Amino acid sequence: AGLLKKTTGLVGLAVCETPHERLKILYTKILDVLGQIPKNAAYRKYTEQITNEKLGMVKAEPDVKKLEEQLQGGQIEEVILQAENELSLARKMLRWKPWEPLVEEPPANQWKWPI
Amino acid sequence: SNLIEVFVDGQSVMVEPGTTVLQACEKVGMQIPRFCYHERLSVAGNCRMCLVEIEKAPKVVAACAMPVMKGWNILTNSEKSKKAREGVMEFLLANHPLDCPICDQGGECDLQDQSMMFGSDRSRFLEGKRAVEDKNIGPLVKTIMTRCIQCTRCIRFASEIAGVDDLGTTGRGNDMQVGTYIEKMFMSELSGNIIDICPVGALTSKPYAFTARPWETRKTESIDVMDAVGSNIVVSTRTGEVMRILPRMHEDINEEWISDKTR
Amino acid sequence: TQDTQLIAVDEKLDITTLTGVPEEHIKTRKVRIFVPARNNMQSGVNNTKKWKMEFDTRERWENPLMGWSSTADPLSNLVLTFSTKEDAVAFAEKNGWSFDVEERKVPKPKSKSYGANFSWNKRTRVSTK
Amino acid sequence: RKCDPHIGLLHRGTEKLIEYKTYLQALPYFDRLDYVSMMCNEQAYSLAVEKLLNIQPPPR
Amino acid sequence: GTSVKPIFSRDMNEAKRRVRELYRAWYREVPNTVHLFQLDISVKQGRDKVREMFMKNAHVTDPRVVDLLVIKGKMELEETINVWKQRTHIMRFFHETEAPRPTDFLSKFYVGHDP
Amino acid sequence: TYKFVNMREPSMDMKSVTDRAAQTLLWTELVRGLGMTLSYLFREPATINYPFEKGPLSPRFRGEHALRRYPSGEERCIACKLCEAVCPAQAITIEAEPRADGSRRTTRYDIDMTKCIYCGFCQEACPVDAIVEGPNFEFSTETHEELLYNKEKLLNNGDKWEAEIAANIQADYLYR
Amino acid sequence: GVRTSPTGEKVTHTGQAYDDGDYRRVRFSDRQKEVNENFAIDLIAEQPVSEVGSRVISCDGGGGALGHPRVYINLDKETKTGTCGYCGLQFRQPHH
Amino acid sequence: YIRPGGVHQDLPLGLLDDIYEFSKNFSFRIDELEEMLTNNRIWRNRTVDIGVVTAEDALNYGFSGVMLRGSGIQWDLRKTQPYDVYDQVEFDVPIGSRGDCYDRYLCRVEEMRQSLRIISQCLNKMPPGEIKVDDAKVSPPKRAEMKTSMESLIHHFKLYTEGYQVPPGATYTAIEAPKGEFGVYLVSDGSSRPYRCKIKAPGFAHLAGLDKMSKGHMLADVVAIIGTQDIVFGEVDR
Amino acid sequence: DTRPTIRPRNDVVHKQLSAFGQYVAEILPKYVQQVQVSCFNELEIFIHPDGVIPVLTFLRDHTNAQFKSLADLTAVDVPTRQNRFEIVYNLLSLRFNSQIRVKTYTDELTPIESSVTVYKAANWYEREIWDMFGVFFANHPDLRRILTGYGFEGHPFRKDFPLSGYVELRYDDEVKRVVAEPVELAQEFRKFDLNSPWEAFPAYRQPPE
Amino acid sequence: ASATRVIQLLRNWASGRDLQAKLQLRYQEISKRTQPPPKLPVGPSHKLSNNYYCTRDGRREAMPPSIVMSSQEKKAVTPAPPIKRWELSKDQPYL
Ligand code: SF4
Ligand code: SF4
Ligand code: SF4
Ligand code: SF4
Ligand code: FES
Ligand SMILES: [K+]
Ligand SMILES: [Zn+2]
Known part of the structure; x- marks a missing residue:
């Protein structure tokens, strides 16, 4: 927390003045969109393993200055940006649906370099 | 049927009884280093570079002349097998004259290729080197006996392949001079093939001497027309002309031998 | 299992037109296939294991000044490497080169022995060792 | 509005001939690739090649 | 094997359909x-x-294949109309500098030993 | 570790802004440039007087090739054919032939100066130090033909620069 | 030394000789046919024959590091005097 | 000079001394640049706030080296992935804070000074020892050993005609070139020759990104952006 | 290192990368056909041609991967494979300082939908893979030639394309314009067959086939 | 160097610094070009005692890529620990 940081050190990236709850209502959203995905999905178990877990201290600890080393994710103003891509990514494999078997096995021994 | 079972550094393979260790290795693709054995020229067993250790062995077996039987895991990449190859090769290379720049075998020499794959990277020799006096057995093949390593591949080739008894290894000790002792000549109709069986530049073609080097010689496949046998041969062409002719691998027609006229 | 607006083409796949080898280098190049025979004075065999894509040699004349080997065959110094053979041929027709093969001269099993060199009736007694 | 950096006015074979030159013979290409940073190129090549060879240069 | 991907056209009918208007542009x-x-x-x-x-x-x-030359041939008409290519780049198609190559069997035989 | 390069804190006191206004109004920083270049003029130049004096070089210099010969005078070259095999531009062409004595050297050692790239690999390749490449760099010309050096041209040049390169490899072979 | 062709055309050590017409000769016109006067073959043949009384003699060629790869040529042939391959200068044993 | 397995030759005796004399005087020469340009208004106005790019687009554009560092991106190959000795040396990476052309110019001149730090640290800490690996199969033997030891002759022979055979596989090795991140990706067939070598050109992505910077600027600034892109074309043209 | 000649290994990164290999493996068993971590701590993700967007978008936005840096993408024309081309992306993660390699196979005709949306650095990185190799990239902004000459014919990096090509230029004074002719060299390439007939390192030897 | 103290003063004042301390040219400080012959060291494995190449097999010791998963409770991991935010340069934090 403390005095609002004038600049985050990355041009284009802006300092958000309400970062803790922005992480909160983002982090709920991936948990929300994860609801559609099946339980057997490998994505979901990994998602919930780091979503509400990392929703933990941000819910508990409110000082973003201490929150830097809570997630080892760098500056908070890009962590919420990173959470945005995770929310974005969750939408992506809501369509890819990758837990089916391979579309096609690799044709003959194409791999196995050298030739 | 009667094909005895045996392992080769792990994986097991069946094999005809009486087969030697060398002939069991290539069944899976192992070309164990050899210098005195030719698959169609007797069995010498003197180069000792075929030495590979068997499982639970107290001593390294000579893979050329050892018949393999049930349950003998060929320890190809074993430390002792590589140790045996390393020691035995340096002994071969010890008295070898420093002729690689001036020797035509350079670029296609088995001694050079072996030292790249199965060999050291420095010398521990601090003495003089043996100097064998040169010989002369014809104008078709040069004789440089200082480069010889006494693989005896020639004397077997003369004895059975060429059917003429005019090659031998006179002397004793370090003084194994392979040649003719007395002054003689070697123009058997297959005497030209004596060049290819030689693993070193000890025997080289006088007409081809100092004319080309192996890497530049583009190779082409053609046939022999000197004779009605129609031998399969490979023609060397570089910079737009032919230098030397080599026999090809054709067990039915020529095996790997060609007539002196063809060569 | 890979339905993406799936279509079917039964024609043998040729890509010569898009590759764009000039029309005099597409039919007048008898492309022959073989496994390189081992150099007969090189006991090693780590060359008799693949397939190549060598062409037919063309005219090689000497340069007037410096005795070069000036050559107008752009494709002379090119060989491909193929593990097995039908891919090598499958390569061959897809650009539609004049095509032929040669079967791999596999070494026949040599029945080797060492006691034969010391026989009692048979002539395989070696005369030197 | 838009700028098209049409390049290729220097495109040499480079990688194309490296398939035909040995590792030692291919080394001088990098000196000529990013020609103003002489050693830094061949630094990459040597680091790359020795990595495959599983051989590390002496500390000197 | 026979079943394969439609890069741009399912059927040879629409292949010419891509050839047609491109020829119109190339006309x-x-x-x-x-x-x-x-x-x-x-x-x-x-x-x-x-x-x-x-x-x-x-x-x-x-x-x-045919519609691959369609995009292949699509790739020079703009290279020309936006004056990207040169006069030397479209006279190249008008092969002019070489002497007429030999057609009859006698002409090849006279010139050299090369089919 | 790291450090910032443009975090600037312009102090907004009445003192400091006076300098900033003084900087903008009176071209102080521009005058800094003028006095900077003036000091350069008042210094000596470093233009070497070519050809009356040339650049400083080193014994390892790579220049124009020249085949040498033994103290006896016979050509060091034995046609081992290593140099063209490593020659990265294939500028070295050579064909060995039988000689009358039997010391069968080459009838052809043609190095194309317009193809060669002066790596010096040929020197390292040669086991008898036959082909070295000398300190000369003035071997310019007006026709492309005279850069296609042949066995005779290298031999003549080796006999020319023999006085120089002999000492160069004398003072550098320990490094090699 | 160096000989001269019928067209003058000083023949190099290799033996090159442009024949009578040989249109390629026109390049030497208005110019000079660069030939090295020193011929290796006869410039080493007159060198003194070494006389060392041993069966095997090294042939480093002077300045071992600076010379040529040291060989161990044999000295037992009395018909002719054995010479190093690289050096070319001849070793002979005095009455062996 | 830089060959696989080390370096080809040794430094001539006293060479470190001359470069030490050069190192002392070059800090002044840097001051000439900064005094000449850094505070000059004409220099700044043609450069400041020109061709700015945000951190996300800069990284997404595949940029590398100073291109990222100028935009405040916290990254450097010599520090994050220290190859060679670069771990046993200290230097401050000059991270900018605006992303425009001026920030990179300050970053580059600071890179000069930090480079001068490396010269001093390497100078006082140059260890003894050999120049190449002690493996003749990949390092040509010493000229002295060439002409006395037979193994050296064979190893030198096959190395200069056939060359060492690199084990099959592939590798994209990456180092921070002064231009940026110059990486070479090669696939080894297992022979003595490479099969295919792909080089990462820092200029390639930079010249690819030349479209984005130029938007919102004049042609007299387009020349400025081309300068800061460090687009040496033989490097970009591969 | 007790053996300064050999390069030391690092198993710490090796099995950590191996752990991350299985991580991505379980998420997409429909795409990831093959995962491989080499001796020199290099991770390889062998993917299906359809997966150029998903796995790269996955590798770019995931919290445990964060691979947003497109190092390079290159093709490896292998004639003996039925899919001659092998497009090989490279990813760099700033957060975990690691490198990820993904491979997709292709014929001459099978297309790859452009990865411009995932990595916008890839815009210029197809204009030459289309040039040098000829693999066409679907739904891509511009597929223009930037390495080959204007109107040049062929894909030179294809291993069936000769070193010297087919066309050589010369300024023809008859037409006052440089023009192309079939190539004819002053000297032909003295190709060298330097592959030793004796087997190399037996570690990667091919199984009896 | 040659240059008199008068215009040396002009350079020093105009440049705002003393230039006689270090100049862009060279002088007698350069090591002379006839350096004595060196005695370059030997290799670490140059010993003629146990030195078998079976030990150092850099080319040979390489192994194929290790098979871990092929087409033919759990925890979440990362390819490496997340980077550490380095601190400012203690020598000079802010330019
Ligand atoms: S036979 Fe082989 S080892 Fe002997 S000199 Fe000739 S090339 Fe060298
Ligand atoms: S001369 Fe050649 S073939 Fe005869 S024994 Fe010696 S190495 Fe063997
Ligand atoms: S320096 Fe020597 S080896 Fe290198 S290109 Fe020139 S002639 Fe060839
Ligand atoms: S100059 Fe040296 S390297 Fe070249 S062929 Fe002659 S001896 Fe061999
Ligand atoms: S093969 Fe057994 S000793 Fe030559
Ligand atoms: K031989
Ligand atoms: Zn000698």
Whole structure:
């Protein structure tokens, strides 16, 4: 927390003045969109393993200055940006649906370099 | 049927009884280093570079002349097998004259290729080197006996392949001079093939001497027309002309031998 | 299992037109296939294991000044490497080169022995060792 | 509005001939690739090649 | 094996459909390219030449291949009309500098030992 | 570790802004440039007087090739054919032939100066130090033909620069 | 030394000789046919024959590091005097 | 000079001394640049706030080296992935804070000074020892050993005609070139020759990104952006 | 290192990368056909041609991967494979300082939908893979030629394309314009067959086939 | 160097610094070009005692890529620990 940081050190990236709850209502959203995905999905178990877990201290600890080393994710103003891509990514494999078997096995021994 | 079972550094393979260790290795693709054995020229067993250790062995077996039987895991990449190859090769290379720049075998020499794959990277020799006096057995093949390593591949080739008894290894000790002792000549109709069986530049073609080097010689496949046998041969062409002719691998027609006229 | 607006083409796949080898280098190049025979004075065999894509040699004349080997065959110094053979041929027709093969001269099993060199009736007694 | 950096006015074979030159013979290409940073190129090549060879240069 | 991907066209019918309007573009441009590139050839020989390279590959049956030359041929008409190519780049198609190559068997035999 | 390069804190006191206004109004920083270049003029130049004096070089210098010969005078070259095998531009062409004595050297050692790239690999390749490449760099010309050096041209040049390169490899072979 | 062709055309050590017409000769016109006067074959043949009384003698060629790869040529042939391959200068044993 | 397995030759005796004399005087020469340009208004106005790019687009554009560092991106190959000795040396990476052309110019001149730090640290800490690996199969033997030891002759022979055979596989090795991140990706067939070598050109992505910077600037600034892109074309043209 | 000649290994990164290999493996068993971590701590993700967007978008936005840096993408024309081309992306993660390699196979005709949306650095990185190799990239902004000459014919990096090509230029004074002719060299390439007939390192030897 | 103290003063004042301390040219400080012959060291494995190449097999010791998963409770991991935010340069934090 403390005095609002004038600049985050990355041009284009802006300092958000309400970062803790922005992480909160983002982090709920991936948990929300994860609801559609099946339980057997490998994505979901990994998602919930780091979503509400990392929703933990941000819910508990409110000082973003201490929150830097809570997630080892760098500056908070890009962590919420990173959470945005995770929310974005969750939408992506809501369509890819990758837990089916391979579309096609690799044709003959194409791999196995050298030739 | 009667094909005895045996392992080769792990994986097991069946094999005809009486087969030697060398002939069991290539069944899976192992070309164990050899210098005195030719698959169609007797069995010498003197180069000792075929030495590979068997499982639970107290001593390294000579893979050329050892018949393999049930349950003998060929320890190809074993430390002792590589140790045996390393020691035995340096002994071969010890008295070898420093002729690689001036020797035509350079670029296609088995001694050079072996030292790249199965060999050291420095010398521990601090003495003089043996100097064998040169010989002369014809104008078709040069004789440089200082480069010889006494693989005896020639004397077997003369004895059975060429059917003429005019090659031998006179002397004793370090003084194994392979040649003719007395002054003689070697123009058997297959005497030209004596060049290819030689693993070193000890025997080289006088007409081809100092004319080309192996890497530049583009190779082409053609046939022999000197004779009605129609031998399969490979023609060397570089910079737009032919230098030397080599026999090809054709067990039915020529095996790997060609007539002196063809060569 | 890979339905993406799936279509079917039964024609043998040729890509010569898009590759764009000039029309005099597409039919007048008898492309022959073989496994390189081992150099007969090189006991090693780590060359008799693949397939190549060598062409037919063309005219090689000497340069007037410096005795070069000036050559107008752009494709002379090119060989491909193929593990097995039908891919090598499958390569061959897809650009539609004049095509032929040669079967791999596999070494026949040599029945080797060492006691034969010391026989009692048979002539395989070696005369030197 | 838009700028098209049409390049290729220097495109040499480079990688194309490296398939035909040995590792030692291919080394001088990098000196000529990013020609103003002489050693830094061949630094990459040597680091790359020795990595495959599983051989590390002496500390000197 | 027979079942395969439609890069741009399912059927040979729409393959020509891509050839048609592209030929129309490759028909229309001739008066303007011959004008601003400042050549000496006439429009008509440009027109019938356009036919010529439309001809040599008018023998393939695979829909992917033919429409691959469609995009391949799509890739020079703009390279010309936006004056990207040079006068030396479109006279190159008008192969002129070489002497006529030999057609009869006698002419090849006289010239050299090369089919 | 790291450090910032443009975090600037312009102090907004009445003192400091006076300098900033003084900087903008009176071209102080521009005058800094003028006095900077003036000091350069008042210094000596470093233009070497070519050809009356040339650049400083080193014994390892790579220049124009020249085949040498033994103290006896016979050509060091034995046609081992290593140099063209490593020659990265294939500028070295050579064909060995039988000689009358039997010391069968080459009838052809043609190095194309317009193809060669002066890596010096040929020197390292040669086991008898036959082909070295000398300190000369003035071997310019007006026709492309005279850069296609042949066996005779290298031999003549080796006999020319023999006085120089002999000492160069004398003072550098320990490094090699 | 160096000989001269019928067209003058000083023949190099290799033996090159442009024949009578040989249109390629026109390049030497208005110019000079660069030939090295020193011929290796006869410039080493007159060198003194070494006389060392041993069966095997090294042939480093002077300045071992600076010379040529040291060989161990044999000295037992009395018909002719054995010479190093690289050096070319001849070793002979005095009455063996 | 830089060959696989080390370096080809040794430094001549006293060479470190001359470069030490050069190192002392070059800090002044840097001051000439900064005094000449850094505070000059004409220099700044043609450069400041020109061709700015945000951190996300800069990284997404595949940029590398100073291109990222100028935009405040916290990254450097010599520090994050220290190859060679670069771990046993200290230097401050000059991270900018605006992303425009001026920030990179300050970053580059600071890179000069930090480079001068490396010269001093390497100078006082140059260890003894050999120049190449002690493996003749990949390092040509010493000229002295060439002409006395037979193994050296064979190893030198096959190395200069056939060359060492690199084990099959592939590798994209990456180092921070002064231009940026110059990486070479090669696939080894297992022979003595490479099969295919792909080089990462820092200029390639930079010249690819030349479209984005130029938007919102004049042609007299387009020349400025081309300068700061460090687009040496033989490097970009591969 | 007790053996300074050999390069030391690092198993710490090796099995950590191996752990991350299985991580991505379980998420997409429909795409990831093959995962491989080499001796020199290099991770390889062998993917299906359809997966150029998903796995790269996955590798770019995931919290445990964060691979947003497109190092390079290159093709490896292998004639003996039925899919001659092998497009090989490279990813760099700033957060975990690691490198990820993904491979997709292709014929001459099978297309790859452009990865411009995932990595916008890839815009210029197809204009030459289309040039040098000829693999067409679907739904891509511009597929223009930037390495080959204007109107040049062929894909030179294809291993069936000769070193010297087919066309050589010369300024013809008859037409006052440089023009192309079939190539004819002053000297032909003295190709060298330097592959030793004796087997190399037996570690990667091919199984009896 | 040659240059008199008068215009040396002009350079020093105009440049704002003393230039006689270090100049862009060279002088007698350069090591002379006839350096004594060196005695370059030997290799670490140059010993003629146990030195078998079976020990150092850099080319040979390489192994194929290790098979871990092929087409033919759990925890979440990362390819490496997340980077550490380095601190400012203690020598000079802010330019
Ligand atoms: S035979 Fe082989 S080892 Fe002997 S000199 Fe000739 S090339 Fe060298
Ligand atoms: S001369 Fe050659 S073939 Fe005869 S024994 Fe010696 S190495 Fe063997
Ligand atoms: S320096 Fe020597 S080896 Fe290198 S290109 Fe020139 S002639 Fe060839
Ligand atoms: S100059 Fe040296 S390297 Fe070249 S062929 Fe002659 S001896 Fe061999
Ligand atoms: S093969 Fe057994 S000793 Fe030569
Ligand atoms: K031989
Ligand atoms: Zn000698």
